[PDB]
Amino acid sequence: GYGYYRTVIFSAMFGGYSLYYFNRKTFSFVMPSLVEEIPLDKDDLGFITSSQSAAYAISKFVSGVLSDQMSARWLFSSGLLLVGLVNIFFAWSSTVPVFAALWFLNGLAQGLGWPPCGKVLRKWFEPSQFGTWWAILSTSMNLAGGLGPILATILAQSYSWRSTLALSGALCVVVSFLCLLLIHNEPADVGLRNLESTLQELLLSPYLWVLSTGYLVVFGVKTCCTDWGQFFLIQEKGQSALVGSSYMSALEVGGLVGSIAAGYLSDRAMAKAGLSNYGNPRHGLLLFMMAGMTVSMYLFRVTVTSDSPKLWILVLGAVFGFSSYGPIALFGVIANESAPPNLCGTSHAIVGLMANVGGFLAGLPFSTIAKHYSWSTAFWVAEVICAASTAAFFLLRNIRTKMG
Amino acid sequence: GYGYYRTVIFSAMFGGYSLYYFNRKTFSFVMPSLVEEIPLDKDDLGFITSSQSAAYAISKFVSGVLSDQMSARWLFSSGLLLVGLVNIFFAWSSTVPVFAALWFLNGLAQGLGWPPCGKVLRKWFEPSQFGTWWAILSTSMNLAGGLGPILATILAQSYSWRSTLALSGALCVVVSFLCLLLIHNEPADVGLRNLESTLQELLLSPYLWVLSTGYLVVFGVKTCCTDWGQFFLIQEKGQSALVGSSYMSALEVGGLVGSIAAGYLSDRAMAKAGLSNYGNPRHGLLLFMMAGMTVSMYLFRVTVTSDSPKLWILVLGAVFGFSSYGPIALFGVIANESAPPNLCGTSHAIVGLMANVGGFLAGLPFSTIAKHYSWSTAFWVAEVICAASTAAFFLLRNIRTKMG
Ligand SMILES: CCCCCCCCCCC(CCCCCCCCCC)(CO[C@H]1O[C@@H](CO)[C@H](O[C@@H]2O[C@@H](CO)[C@H](O)[C@@H](O)[C@@H]2O)[C@@H](O)[C@@H]1O)CO[C@H]1O[C@@H](CO)[C@H](O[C@@H]2O[C@@H](CO)[C@H](O)[C@@H](O)[C@@H]2O)[C@@H](O)[C@H]1O
Ligand SMILES: CCCCCCCCCCC(CCCCCCCCCC)(CO[C@H]1O[C@@H](CO)[C@H](O[C@@H]2O[C@@H](CO)[C@H](O)[C@@H](O)[C@@H]2O)[C@@H](O)[C@@H]1O)CO[C@H]1O[C@@H](CO)[C@H](O[C@@H]2O[C@@H](CO)[C@H](O)[C@@H](O)[C@@H]2O)[C@@H](O)[C@H]1O
Ligand SMILES: CCCCCCCCCCC(CCCCCCCCCC)(CO[C@H]1O[C@@H](CO)[C@H](O[C@@H]2O[C@@H](CO)[C@H](O)[C@@H](O)[C@@H]2O)[C@@H](O)[C@@H]1O)CO[C@H]1O[C@@H](CO)[C@H](O[C@@H]2O[C@@H](CO)[C@H](O)[C@@H](O)[C@@H]2O)[C@@H](O)[C@H]1O
Ligand SMILES: CCCCCCCCCCC(CCCCCCCCCC)(CO[C@H]1O[C@@H](CO)[C@H](O[C@@H]2O[C@@H](CO)[C@H](O)[C@@H](O)[C@@H]2O)[C@@H](O)[C@@H]1O)CO[C@H]1O[C@@H](CO)[C@H](O[C@@H]2O[C@@H](CO)[C@H](O)[C@@H](O)[C@@H]2O)[C@@H](O)[C@H]1O
């Protein structure tokens, strides 16, 4: 049955992705115990995390490019097995260089997880049910990250820090075999079906670069606000050290809610509306959320004094999180849906690369501008850039959409 | 006349490239005066240099890829004009963010200089005279860098720091028009001649990846030695603070001599020997210099005690510089010569990217290994890697050379 097969594939995917993220964050989970056992300074942890991040970025781009030439099931299982083996080996090392070398292969293996999931979802689900399940897998990753630390410390205070990593690796290996056994690549491999534009022609379309610039701006603004909102609130507004934590929590909760709601409403709008070679039914929600993000930025910058109630700050944070985390999922869904049946990964790898460079831009120059002039000037610059981007995106709404 | 036209093109190229490098390094040349005028801390200078370096790397790759679709003369002149304009605008600014934003466009413009020169050299010169002139252009860059500082401080102590940059920009604009007028793209544009493998077929050849890995190892080892030789000599050998400076000077001089000699001897060997689809006449010198580099590394690591004469240290530094700076030029020449008549830039951009990642590897993990274990262990690791690479390169000598 279609429902039975979809349920089985979805359950296996959910479990695999949750284990992926747990084993990504296990070192940060268990850091205090190994710090107590073998002392480390602040440089070693940063070096290890930096190596993992660089490996993750490079692998992610490469596996996104290559995911259209190899089977999704084998890619998923191999990545999970390598992640488990790397964790098991990490459990039996006691020197920084070996730690940092083992945490690089971890990023390389982690880069292989999502593109197979995206391809299987696209080939198994109808285009009117392809933003809901995307967001639900994102929430699977969120749930794994949220439930990680509590169980991690609960288990670590009981036995040790070395046993937890080995147990996680063994569980990853077992679940890798289970997912290999359970996941099906295509409906044709069972007896159903739910249904050429070379790379040179794909790269010669303007929609790809429009989406890349949109992702640039959205990710950069989100990173700027997430990284420096507490700093702005503490050093210029005059608030305490708990209002920042509450504002971050509200931002995260509102962002999760906004991602799910954006996916569902966009899928409903696409199902309701028709299809044509020009335009996209998913653009209205994207433009609305962009405008909401800009308005919330302006309100937070201007109408938050030293005597503002805490409820107002929480409301502003929630609204910005909603309107900033919706469009990210929308771009991720669109860059893969509005592509030929092949080259889906190659239509998303470039977008991820733009996200990385936008993160670097949100990191260094924003901080130096804030240090020199002020935080108000830096946030004003970010808001002006976002408003200009939104205006350009609205001006370029009805364009050649289907690339190829 | 062939000689007259070659002389004119060579002179214009030499002048253009020398001005390119002078305007690359002018800020480092004139830094003390502007530091005295407007105080700066150590973070701002690093930020500016980092922005320029990142822009240079990205532009270099992009312009190497794109240099086969646009005219070399126009690319050269446009790059020089933009460099001059950027310097002129930099002369009229007084704040760090604007400085760092203007020093990014400088890197973007600088990335456009060399690939047009390489294409013109390949299309104008015979393959038996294409390693000598390559090395001579490299020495043009070296001469510009060497004669920069003296003239820079001599002029800066006279008038100001603001006038020097404007004068350099104006000179760059004038020389840009002169080079636009003088450089000829092809011999067919005058009435002579001195004489399809798509990118997908080009990327499916093993010679490209062999060359990429060789450049990886050579550049990484050279960067390791250049960066940490003084540290090793001072903190483990027990030598003074002037022996390191002498060792660096000997390394640089020996490297320049080795680059010129390697180019000349390799061109002579290729002219003497025949041509075939398998192998390359330029491999013997490359293997010999690789072996010399490994032997010199071992001798410097082992046979240099706290009582070694300074002449021995100078000799070892000169030999390593020779044997390390030869192969870099050899790889640069080969990756462009042993390529189809098109895609020459695309056959060198990947090699440059590998050089960048090898530089990062030589930078961070080598330093952390040296900090944890010792400098001797780090240099032993580098020497072992170089020896293994040399053995693999010798084992893979006679292979499919002409890619396509
Ligand atoms: C084989 C590949 C051949 C070509 C490679 C290209 C260039 C080679 C290296 C370039 C590159 C990978 C290449 C990107 C994709 C390549 C795809 C293009 C294919 C071309 C066909 C690594 O290179 C940089 O990586 C930095 C690590 O951040 C290092 O900083 C070190 O750590 C610093 C502490 O922050 C200190 O300053 C110091 O400790 C070091 O300085 C740099 O020294 C290093 O140069 C840049 O990638 C970028 O990815 C992203 C996400 O990871 C990173 O963003 C952030 O990283 C972490 C915070 O750092 C966060 O955790 C992460 O959340 C965040 O997102 C970037 O930072 C950067 O990593
Ligand atoms: C089919 C449906 C699927 C089910 C999904 C539902 C479950 C999702 C909730 C999980 C959730 C919400 C918590 C509110 C719950 C109420 C919400 C109402 C609805 C749910 C009922 C818990 O998130 C927090 O949970 C806390 C408790 O563990 C942790 O505190 C710890 O406690 C200490 C030890 O006690 C520790 O020592 C200490 O380290 C912590 O202080 C926090 O670290 C964690 O952020 C969010 O988690 C997820 O959000 C994302 C945001 O992007 C976050 O990713 C971030 O991305 C970057 C930013 O873009 C950041 O740069 C990056 O850093 C980060 O990776 C993560 O946070 C992720 O995990
Ligand atoms: C639109 C492009 C879309 C994709 C971009 C890819 C990823 C985006 C950013 C990745 C990338 C450019 C991309 C490489 C080529 C891309 C071609 C691939 C095309 C794919 C189809 C910049 O990204 C890094 O650049 C570093 C600058 O070094 C920054 O470090 C900052 O500064 C630090 C102080 O050293 C501090 O830690 C701190 O102040 C910051 O942390 C990092 O924060 C930053 O992440 C990494 O490139 C690399 O190039 C080389 C040579 O320049 C650099 O090596 C060195 O740099 C200087 C010493 O640094 C030296 O002067 C230079 O002599 C030396 O060689 C590398 O360092 C790196 O720059
Ligand atoms: C058709 C033929 C063409 C003619 C070519 C011949 C001319 C070439 C000679 C120029 C030469 C040799 C000097 C010995 C001369 C005898 C040699 C015998 C033959 C010649 C007769 C002078 O080189 C030095 O000259 C000194 C005097 O200016 C400078 O000291 C300054 O003084 C203070 C102010 O007084 C200043 O305040 C202070 O900053 C300095 O201390 C040094 O900065 C400079 O290095 C070498 O220059 C060139 O070498 C390359 C090496 O790769 C170097 O590039 C490096 O690459 C990276 C490393 O891979 C490095 O990381 C990177 O940092 C660097 O970019 C540069 O050095 C480059 O410029």
From Swiss-Prot, chains A, B:
Organism: Homo sapiens
Membrane disposition: Multi-pass membrane protein
GO biological process, one term: gluconeogenesis
Known outcome of mutating G145E: In GSD1B; inactive glucose-6-phosphate transport
Name of the protein described by the UniProt record: Glucose-6-phosphate exchanger SLC37A4
Family statement drawn from the similarity comment of this UniProt entry: Belongs to the major facilitator superfamily. Organophosphate:Pi antiporter (OPA) (TC 2.A.1.4) family.
Regulation of its function: Inhibited by vanadate and chlorogenic acid.
GO molecular function: glucose 6-phosphate:phosphate antiporter activity; glucose-6-phosphate transmembrane transporter activity
PANTHER family recorded: GLUCOSE-6-PHOSPHATE EXCHANGER SLC37A4 (PTHR43826:SF3)
